Amino acid sequence: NFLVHSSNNFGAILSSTNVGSNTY
Amino acid sequence: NFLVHSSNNFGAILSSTNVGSNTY
Amino acid sequence: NFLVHSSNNFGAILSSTNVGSNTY
């Protein structure tokens, strides 16, 4: 069992996450 | 069993996620 | 069993996800 995980990133990443604004 | 996972990214990524704004 | 997964990205990606705005 030989397992290899490779992740390479070379680009700018912009992330906006909004969770909420719910009225109950 | 030989397993290889390769992920390469070279492009700018913009992500906007909005979860919410529900009225109950 | 030889398994290889390769993912290469070179293009700009723009993603907008909106989940919500439901009135109950």
Added chain:
Amino acid sequence: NFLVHSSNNFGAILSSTNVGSNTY
């Protein structure tokens, strides 16, 4: 058993997903 998965992307991708706006 030899398995190979290759995915290559070179084009700009724009995705808009809206789930919601349901009145109950």
Added chain:
Amino acid sequence: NFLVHSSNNFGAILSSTNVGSNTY
């Protein structure tokens, strides 16, 4: 058993998905 999957993309893709706006 030799299996090969190849996907190559070179064109701009624009996708708009709207699920919702149902009145109950």
Added chain:
Amino acid sequence: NFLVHSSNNFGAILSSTNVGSNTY
């Protein structure tokens, strides 16, 4: 059992996360 995990980052990353603004 041979396991290798490699993560390499070379791009600027900007992340904004907002959780809240719920009225009860």
Added chain:
Amino acid sequence: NFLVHSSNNFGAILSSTNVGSNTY
């Protein structure tokens, strides 16, 4: 100008929507 919209639902509704699984 008098306008009235009335929607009444009394039956169980099951909806499954799958958008995707496209290879480019």
Added chain:
Amino acid sequence: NFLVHSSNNFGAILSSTNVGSNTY
């Protein structure tokens, strides 16, 4: 100008929405 919107729901609703699983 008199406008009235009324929505009444009395039935169980089950909704499954899957957007994605696209290979580029």
Added chain:
Amino acid sequence: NFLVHSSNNFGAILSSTNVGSNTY
């Protein structure tokens, strides 16, 4: 100009939304 919006819900609602699982 008289405007009235009324929404009443009395039934159990189950919603599952999955957006993603795209390979680029």
Added chain:
Amino acid sequence: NFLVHSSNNFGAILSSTNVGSNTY
């Protein structure tokens, strides 16, 4: 200009939202 918004909820609501699991 008279405006009234009324939302009443009496049923249990279960919501699961998953955004992600994308490989770039």
Added chain:
Amino acid sequence: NFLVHSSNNFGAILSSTNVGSNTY
């Protein structure tokens, strides 16, 4: 200009939101 917003909730609400698990 008379504006009234009323929101009343009487049912148990369970919400699970997962944003992430993306490999770059």
Added chain:
Amino acid sequence: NFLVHSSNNFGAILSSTNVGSNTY
């Protein structure tokens, strides 16, 4: 200009939000 906002909650609310687990 008369404005009134009223929010009333009487039901137990359980919320789980996970943002993260991204590999770069």
